[model samples]
Target: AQGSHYKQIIKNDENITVNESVPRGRILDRNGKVLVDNASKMAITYTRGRKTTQSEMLDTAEKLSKLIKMDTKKITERDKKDFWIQLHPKKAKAMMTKEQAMLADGSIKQDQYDKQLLSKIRKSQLDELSSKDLQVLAIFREMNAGTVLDPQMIKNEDVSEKEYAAVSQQLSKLPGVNTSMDWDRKYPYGDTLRGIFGDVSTPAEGIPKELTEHYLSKGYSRNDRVGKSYLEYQYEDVLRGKKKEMKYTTDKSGKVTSSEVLNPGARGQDLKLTIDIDLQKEVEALLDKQIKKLRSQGAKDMDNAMMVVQNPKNGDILALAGKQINKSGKMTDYDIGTFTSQFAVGSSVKGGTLLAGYQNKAIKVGETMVDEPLHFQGGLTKRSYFNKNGHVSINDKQALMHSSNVYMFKTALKLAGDPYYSGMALPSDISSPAQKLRRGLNQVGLGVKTGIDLPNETRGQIEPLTNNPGNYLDLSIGQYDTYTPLQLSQYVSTIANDGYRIQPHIGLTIHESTNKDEVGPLKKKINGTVLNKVNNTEKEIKQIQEGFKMAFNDKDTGYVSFKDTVVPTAGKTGTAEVFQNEPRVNSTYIGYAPIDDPKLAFSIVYTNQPVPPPWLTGGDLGRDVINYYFK
Candidate 1:
């Protein structure tokens, strides 16, 4: 039985092997432009062996520190221990007197005497090291993280060519040290859409502590590099590549006897996004230009701007840019894309409100509503910016064109009931009107997730209505809820597509590998993935479209800001007053181009742009983006 058990153990060892793998797949743009990929670099590595002494390791670290310019001033608790050990010899000699020395020498239990002496030495030497010696000890302490049987990275890919050659030539002098080539992550468009692409961990950082067991169960080693955040973390399974396998011969005692490679492993899969890098660059430049103009005009409160453009028919995001001004007044890429950021949409959502009214049979196409001042008992009055004091009437199309606040305020009254008053006292139930409007907006893709492929999407917040009737009224004008730029784009695209709400996606496809200069076969194709349909008729949508057109083209009430566009465009401009830290405002424009046969839809927002506002409106910036594409 003993012989059979030994044979079974040997067989088990022969059948099992240790596995090691590299990264997940590469990330690319819609046109196969490599966004993130692996490049080769020379690295200096330290391999620890059995019988390596602490003294020898510290000496090696001191030598390496001089060869390279490294900051070793950061100290840790382990540094204190090593510092105590280093000063023990001199400290013990100074404290020891003739009587104590004789007692220690003649003690029956010499081990106790030595231990007591070392304890006293440690106490005496504590915090006694100078700053210069402490830095050297810190460097020495860092190099000791590697175990006696494993390799530790001493220097990453930052080694210079001269330094690399010197290290390679001194292998004989430097014990257990060698230079090796390894793959390094490279971003072709550095800091451009970096947050979207995400980031990966270095070899030394390895798998994070919180996720160690999870990764280990997935066959990842403790030292394996892994995706840290965003897309890198979201698509880790698809991007993680196969690992190299090595068979190990073991004894009956379950000890590893010998090991050899069985497979070389491969790189991760590749991803193709719908974004056009060239278009992204142009969009960023345009936004920066506008921001600079605003800053020059003394709009110091202006901090960031965001824009997202998508194919209306299929819901593929083409270019998404978020730019912000830094403390030094320099423009840098801000990662406030659709999934991660949001702001009050203001009147930009009025177009969707019209659709919601139609969906609930609250209003009809071409039906006229009183666009005059809405007065309440408490001296509260509401009116459109264009008709603050004047009494006017507007049909559905005219309401959208003029961005009539009175028209929407009336719709809010219709939602509550025919005899509702804005200043009326609390009713026992105020949730009905709020629920009706919320349901309507949600049906058309507002205040909800876009079902975007990216992770960590925020389902925007909507304030709960109180017994106060004005709260429900506020919902109709987009004052009570916030929506992301992506969500606003979806709302406009839904109208442009004549009612179908499509799921927005940035992932266009996947490739086999990025080895060749050309794109590979379609691993996958992502196109029109419908999420919902706005419960509105074709005629109702057409009416909404006409209003948007009038906002840009109707010489009387339309904005002249976009009249010179190369292509026929339709849009709505919105300005919302909000208080954040101090008083601020959000300017927004939601629109679509080639109104006769709409193809592209977009949304732009300049958030917290000071009380006085910028020299330009959101509509002006949107026109520039449209012209850049259509012209």
Candidate 2:
């Protein structure tokens, strides 16, 4: 009578504090489709003497063990513990079943269930901590804190309907047992950008008893979840947006009587990516085919490849793909949009080097530089290197066409060695040895991370050109230290677009069908975003562009245009051997289409083995890709 009176008084006059916990945000593609959303789940906690009878408890345990295939040892341990035991949430399945209730009645031991279950949970934990080399266990031990059991870390987690029924039936019988909504993560796109987006997991294991109680007291639900990685974690505030309230009333028998919905959650902001899903898929297929063929031909153990496509007008990344195939014809766990580890950029990096030298007026086109066989600091390491495909004595125009190693060394030596020889001497002010080499490499985007929107990006490294990084001859040849394909693509786009850099974006706009103003811009940011440098001498750069155009003249040169279409374009091909010390090397090509006036800037990197025994060059694959687009 006193309790009833107090409850009535409290309901009428006591303060009703409402505290809400916000859920994590959703991830969206450029199309505004929900790539990730909040998934519903349920967790089961067991209590002592909660069973109606010993038979009922034994039946619940047996049924649950059979339904989910729970280990007998685990259930036995759980039945022995005094504190509550938490079972992994059964997801997207019905709450409970009669069979499970009957099994719980027969199987569960009221007194020892929690301790036994907790012991089972802890047994596998020590193994995980040892294998994963985690620190939490030792830290807790040092602090004299309670031990953790059964650390729940698994790659894949799911529960069937029958399993949930068993768990639910047991929870309903025990007064100490609790059943509540839980969280499960969902990814709509699956593996498309999974590598870049990352995945989520529980934070450590076992929730604190007090923490759960505190949430219940404060009117916060136990079901709220948080973002686990990348942009989701970084932009948690923006994504979470706002929270809503839900009210419920229960009868004296602990059955829900009624419920009220006061507020609903705010929809998460969407990110429209720049990637063209169809185009990206096609490119990945093509690259994957070539890589598979390489392994089938027993093309050594070496394998590598990378490719990217961008819109020159807006710097939109249409596609970025990379893959490595082994001799077994199996891929090395590559996700389509994921970045390659990084490899020496080879001759693809030439433009950046030349741009820097040109910025300082160190090298000039149409200037005579002998391309005959040449050696730098000649020795075992200093063996004379020539463009394997080049003939002796070609002008700078031909030097670029043939990618002459000798030509590059003489130019670098002149730029770095002697400052007096009609631009013959390299400037002394540019610093010597290590600094000068870095200056040249840094002039372009090499040795730096591209800071691309996608995660896990790599900044290919370029070491100093002594015997350390290899001879200047090799530096002249564009080897040692690599750059990612995207970096090279951006560089080419920069050169083709002539100084204006439209930041590379994956999505175009965001739209709300109901309200026009709510929609985002069709295309995101404009030019000059995130680009570090622009050529001051646009005129000189144009002259270089002209040289590139000449190489593709079907009438003037016999170098086959891999594409059937006769469109004017400017491009450079790169073939780098020995990528990141891996036996498999990398091949890359960066080009801008419709040379006279640009439309598309693209890059292709095929690491691992080359196409075949005969011949495979960037020009070959590139022309095929562009010609198809043009037609």
Candidate 3:
């Protein structure tokens, strides 16, 4: 048994301790699809010996490079760049006044160069002999960068099976070089769900310097790989494994005389996500297909789209897909669903506005308002995109089905108790239209964080609700504020779940290990967690459902494009026009299926459509997607 003062063991017996970090936890989908895991392979590693010279290190690199086909050229250039940057502070020492020079520590002397700044900088950068000098220098640079006594990787990936055999055969000849099994982080589903899994540090790159102290305080070595972003960073504590330590005894000459294992660390616990990889992949494909179809038809500006599918009952995210076109014009997953990157969700928010109106007692369920072109002066002018001069009397249900901007506009006016009039520019300070509007929208999870398990969730921008009367009309139509796809899904889910706002979560369960490629004994299970409940009555919610159903079912007034959907889906469509330097528009749809029972609710956003015309509207996509679900 080790004593409590094990850290002090070295002082009494020239002991050397080395920590061997275990593999990070595996990530799996709900259906047992391995998302991320490690693959072990033979790697050529180097350990620095005491009193090793730069020349001797260069000789070893040369011999190893031929066996590994290492890219010594790139390594050489990077070293030169790093070396120049490191020396500039010292070089500037000569130019500084004595007082300024004193501020930067003394001048760089050759005798202290290797021990001072150069050594620290070299600990981070790369080399060559001729061929031998070039390779050995590179290997030496890697060794110098790693922690003392740690085996630093030189070439881990590209070593051919034949080369591994040759290197092993000549192991007796090489002094510091050796072959060992190394874990290469791999994702079985190649780049399908790229950015979300997060990334690990390469053995050569190690932990970033800025986070050195932060991680070290948590028992991490300088060379330990850490979760860099997203889930990897978010659940790092759960995913990071325990590190093993090896105790060594060294002689008075600073040579390791003996070594033994002090601790054998355990790997991180496995994470099982709520996402169905199959469904996620399908949604991504659908969005990508739509993006390409639009682009092929000369809609160059129609570049990005996002989709979110969740169980409205509990807020478990089933599929979250983000698709965007790169500069090279190839479609790929964008993976920014948690943030509304850029969108003006025009009329899809009208439903929420209607709910807000009811909550504020500004509008009643059966209250009728004339759906006609609205006009106002001094930034008050607004008109319905569908009802151009058609003075159709629209009630709450008709307002949603026909997507009547006038009806919503009237609701916004009622929320402030402002009488209807033409070209009426009320004092900007006369009312809190934004506030009243936010009051209702916020209840449904708009303009607020959805409390998702992911990181970097932005509360989509909301224009301050001063007394701007005209802006309130825009706010009613979803033009004044933006929302993330995840939030939008939550908004619709709130309606589906009968005003209950559930927290959106991706992590479903955690296991001790994925030993049999199956979900092991559960370590943790994330149940359906409710975040908040909107202050809405069942009658009020029933009214909204009626309107959503009308949008899909009504043959005359509603968007009947998806009327033939296998399962009844109630939803709303939006087309928000954005005039930022140039005119662009975002098409959006929010809805749920099996309207009576309501199992799933979703939101789809297609942004930056330069032109208005499309083979499919946001509603059409929603219908098809819902059909896919039912089919």
Candidate 4:
């Protein structure tokens, strides 16, 4: 953006012309550490021969087979192709290796079949492959053949540096196997925020196989690096720099001269992440512990998806995580994103619904909803709704901690006024149970995407309010549709931050290798642009904050179960049903530590897990992981 940066390229397509390299960007963290940095990578190829007229081709092919780890029989089968069937002699259709080069040079000589490679070639007895054939081999047997070898010009030797160096050094020695550096994306924290950070795949994997094969056949190497999922795909072009022309010379003998071109390849810029590696690890570990605890307690299906921890003060996201990696260490294929799941919100919605009543000045602490029998008897519609416990009495705060459906339903009716009461809003406003529920959900940042920085984030869907009957029961409990872990946490964070909303971001910024320019400063612009940064109404924020503190931090609320912890926390718990008989429930708890002056907020979602037969909720497990994290 600052100045003109350029590189040259020469193409032999029709009329050879010079082209300039394109400029790519960088990625960085909140603190500006390089996460996804770019660099070059290359492979090795061989151009040598085996000896003997009758056995030269066979021996060379055999030697190549062993060196490159291919089947000799396969090579022999290929040789059987008719000349009409033969594609191109110079094209490497078989295998080759560094050892074959040694044999060609007589250094690691084989028999005369190996020694008289030139002699055999002259007599039409040996397969005297030119560097062209080796190049072709590099194409056919990519991992083993080794052509278009790369050097890491980008200079990013991050993850597995030792292995990278070893490979680079060894491959650099063989011709037809030149090292040409290319850019790569990397996350330095070794999967600290791997779940949200996402992964990249080679173009061959991301694109159609036909396209991949087509590119390979045409001699134009494919863009091997592609963002397969989240972060990478979300910000692919930004992280991957522009393409450039690279120079190489060919010898009169049609051999490649290992030299530089006038123009060099461009390297990708570095990226900074929003994630705090230390915090991310801590939260991930805590989530892991909770999952283990539940599973150990005879609970099955701990594949809870998406957990997010955000800093409301500055909108800095501290953690975003998930569970359920297979035994072979692969991420399970599931919704995985927040806002798109359909689980019951259980007690977690209580606080917001209560807040809604308070906003309407309709709810009083210790006020009780009419206690009813297990029998269903209500409006003309006559829907059966029962309390969690057989008709329990409770106040607003106690209702949240003890989780009373009767209390919540009554509160919803009072604040919302029917079908919560009779059926729907007061005409002008759709104040039905579902309508008011949406309001409460809005306050909690539920039923909406949290606008996180990661890719593929989903929006929480609140079932559309309809004129249809049986709506009150559905509204009474947080059920139907889906909310992602981030959405759930965003709700909690709003309460913790006192109604402030902040967009969660995992990546911070991107910078140049020279440290001269920051390519992705927008990635870290968090002072005011994101939600919850502005104190539009301190009074409103305070009211919400105080309400949450009372609901979760107060002893009267039974949340005192957490009083023993070093940091005072204000939290909420939830248990939402997925279906009947199958009866899967997603449990969640979200809150911040040192409640009076919060620093971080987080949520844990455990799905398809068995609930403790009698009673257990997200809060109980949430407390466990929260305690472990702070501890």
Candidate 5:
């Protein structure tokens, strides 16, 4: 604010202050690869004065519209209707009925009468308007979206240089029209984690509707660009740079004549995210191919594939990717969907189920159980997928290695202090064991928030436990509770790291801005914060690890999808049945590498499939991506 010289020289003149925007900070991967950045663009903006009227603003919009060509294809029917009334005032007035003056010599209330007249404008009748008429309406659509005294963008996207120069020369004709340089949020790695990188608000959208009061209190201008959602939203304050302040000298008529810079604002702090763009690219490629493959085949209601890989020792989010093949067959990034979307990830959580059993003393490290079919007089008949009809005796490790649901069910029974007697009238109130099992899973990041750096992490859905003991068993095997791919990543990481439930984080550090393209000195370390360790002992946790190790080598299960992987591996796989429209399956897979000393852990899901087509299944993507991690 060193403006003493201006104060001395403009002593007799009026002055006003204004703010200009600075480029937002860049977003980068841990290795200093750029992900999100900014690009300068020509923009036509409007700053309505306190006395600016709708009529006057409408006049300006029509004038501006004639100067530049605007696309009208995206305009809605409502927009056309409103614009029609503005153009044909007499025709709109004639649409009002005689009863419009019924009450107090005004047959109907003005608001109600106005609404009645609006619907009478037969929607398609607006089609009579020429293309030029529609363009004016399109510009007004944006002009009306701003608050008073705030700059609103009439046209920013695809704005042309000729239009900018034309408008600059006609400032004398247009009352409040102004030209400015605007920033377009750019993604160098397009659509790769773009959703998770989130979005920035357009000038027309200025401040998000829901967060208006919150942002206003923080001194944000109504038309200032703010991060609208996801990680961009999460790191808004840091990503939004300081605005450059300007002082202008005005004439006696309050018209600005001269201007001077006060403070050249600084760029926002750069974010160093934990993601490795190289691996992220590979992960996204794998998910995209598999998802498209499934869709090309005969998968039903199946459009999404999510995968998350992290370092187990420290909760750094190495790579997380999601692909959505929308109905139109267009591919878009759903990276944020990794944590935002939840699924009933079946037995991929069997590792934690056994951990709960061992911690509660319900079972020992290698306790043996009958994996044969269990039938009740009035309840569900549960059995392992492999030994559906025959009785198979197996130890705890073998039960998990073979992905046995029966062992998990019996373990849930023991944790709740109840003994299953085939058809001995199951207990009505089984909330005790439900709570016990949930608590066990919570320790390992299941049915609970993984304490990720991102906001709104889904605390997996824990069905309201009823008197039905069947649900309690389902919860034991992860059939009942739904979890995000991120939570599943943390789940397997906890088991792989022995017992540490380290907090998962996408941001690794915050850095300062510098020249010469070097990652500035680290301002803060944002990753590697431990939330808590599980309740189980080292031996008990290792026992689950051993089970995962055996599961990968087992001839029947892991050998199908994971055996051919180049790196030595250990993992678990599961699937849940869901009846949406018709019968479908939710398949899940989780794994870590080098069996002896693990480095990377991952969770992958292919949800809501009619059936696993012979060529591929859920674990395939995880195997393919995992090999890339080491290879």
Candidate 6:
């Protein structure tokens, strides 16, 4: 085994290190039910031999074209010109002019030179190739796609058994052609959370162009499969495993003599999400069913809805569901939009407004306010929906129970250090109190990030307080700045947990996986994170809680009652008045169940709904969902 002895074999044999692709990790629910997994498929592949000529590839494509059929329309105009140049070398070469050649500097880049030739290629020239020739072009392009000696798939989907048998028996006549098994994603629940589960880039698509350098710098091959978005992108490292390394020994004639496995790669770790698939499925169906029923009542513009549910104590997201009926009368999923889209929710945020008033000491517990039609200088008359044309004396609990807009405005005025009088000119500059109100509201996760684990969540769109009393009043009523559905869920969850704003998270645990079918022992358990605590007294917080309870009681306008029902519940109802081109309303609800020791909290939204004599109440949906949850 000396140097000379090893040199003999080293010069005679070729050692090729091939990286074999492995299965991606499975995504599962908290109960270990698979949400996303890989299914194996038979794929036909072609490997370019060393020193293979472009003309030789064209000849092979001509032979292979006779045995198979593929879609020829995939070739674009650029592909046609490129294929034409290769087929007619002399004609393409003569397209170069002396003037263009003179324009070339010290060294003419091939791309610049080719650009001129491509422009000279005419549509009339491309049409000369018959449909059969175009078929051969499709096959030849795929054969020339990858680096020499690397396998590339020719057909991986919809390959019939007869076609596979024909290709298998004719391998001896074809050079560097073979067949193998590969995997593609399979969804057992059929589009449930499919958008959030995300997708992987294919070999032809490769690493996305924008992230090309990022993957290359990390020692990843350009053709390597990678996660492109959502959960797949969030946990890339945990869900991806090392590729199998193998040695292919070839003899002097470039024929493979022997194959040996260098390493058997491991599968990726499995994810145990905090979702309840049964609840997720049921809620998704309910949302779609509700939309159909609403549309039948001629609520045509009421096209979209979203809902989010979570455990208040631990911040585990139970379900996130959304649906949209497009103008074409087709329904589609909008789950990701629940956190990505922003809207102005109505009176549901009054709890935070009252909380701010109590914490600022501008208003005391059970304080009564004169709820009447309010008119300020250069502003329109503002009145509560149920009490339009009269003055009513209301306390904190009764104001929430009746959704009194005038009561909240008076509190907002007091918090701004300007108690409303008969002829009071409200302070011009409202920044001090506006931000003060926002600061108090932030403690309960309003107009801010809820710290959800998902990336790129919109914190909400805030407007500048330009000394406008009307805008400030609008902010107090949840009609100015916009917040996402998940943020509203966090707001109610914060109140349910007795002042703690727990960070919402969907990933509960990471488990080891030996194969796609098995979920192994725990590798890591996710711990809860309490972002912040509401900076208000326990007594005042309890008062707000009582107001929420009154919102569901059998009063004058308690939206949804749960008396003699499954479990005790408390919540707030909203009807945001939105005027965009046409007048519209957004029906919303935020609530918690088992009010004493709350376990579940949720938020519901129906956007751009018809504003007419009758409106669809989100509380109706909330009550049904909560009742089913208790059952």
C-alpha lDDT of all candidate models, in order: 0.69, 0.49, 0.69, 0.50, 0.74, 0.75
All predictions: root-mean-square deviation over Cα?
10.1, 12.8, 9.9, 13.2, 7.0, 9.6
lDDT of 2: 0.49
Q: Which ranges of candidate 1 are over 4 A from the true structure? A: 1-20, 43-155, 158-181, 212-221, 248-264, 313-328, 379-388, 419-428, 513-518, 555-560, 612-615
Specify the poorest-scoring 10-residue window by lDDT in model 4: 146-155
Report residue 58 deviation for candidate 3 (angstroms).
14
Clash count of each predicted structure:
10, 60, 10, 59, 7, 0
Q: Judged by TM-score, which candidate is best?
A: 5
- Per-residue C-alpha lDDT of model 5 across residues 418-454, encoded as one tens digit per residue: 7667776666787777777788888878877888777
Q: Give one digit per residue, the lDDT tens place, for model 4 in 1-631.
A: 2111222344442223333433335455566655554433332333332212323333333343333332222233233221112334322222224446766688774663323332222323224544334433333333223222332111122323235455554342332233333334445666564555556554224343554663456343454445556666566655554454445555555455554444443444555666655655665565555555444554555455446666664444455445464212233434244434545555566666666666555565345565443323343333224434355454555566555556665665565554243343322443354665566566556766677665556675555565532444455556654566677677777766656666665555544433245442233333323453222245544544554566565544326435545656777666455654366656666667667667777776666666634344334444554554456
Number of the candidate with higher lDDT, 4 or 5: 5
Q: Give one digit per residue, the lDDT tens place, for model 6 in 1-631.
A: 0000000122223876666667777888878888987755456677876868877878777888887787886777877777874566444446666525655663566676777677777899888778887898888778878688787776664444344454465463577677744556778999898877888776556688887987788888777778888888777777776666767788777888888876677677888788888878877777777666576665566766888888885555555555455434576777887788888788889999998888888889789867767655545544556435766567787788777787888888899988887546767988888887888888888888877766678989988885976788888899988888888999998888888888888787887756535687889877558888777778778888988887776455435434426758888877678867377777777888888889899888887776634345445667667777887
- Please give the lDDT score for candidate 5: 0.74
User: Among all windows of ten consecutive residues in candidate 6, which has the lowest summed lDDT?
Assistant: 1-10
Give the distance in Å from residue 150's predicted Cα in candidate 3 to where it truly belongs.
16
User: What would the TM-scores of all predictions be?
Assistant: 0.76, 0.65, 0.76, 0.64, 0.78, 0.77
lDDT (Cα, tens digit) per residue for candidate 2, span 501-579? 4456443443221111233333233232555555537765665575555554522321454333655567776655653
lDDT for residue 169 in candidate 4, whole number 0-100? 46
Question: Which has the higher TM-score value, candidate number 1 or candidate number 4?
Answer: 1
RMSD in Å for candidate 6, one decimal? Answer: 9.6
Query: 1 or 6: which has the higher lDDT?
Result: 6
Model 2 — TM-score against the truth? 0.65
lDDT of 3 by residue, 46-79 (tens): 7765657655666666566666655665455545
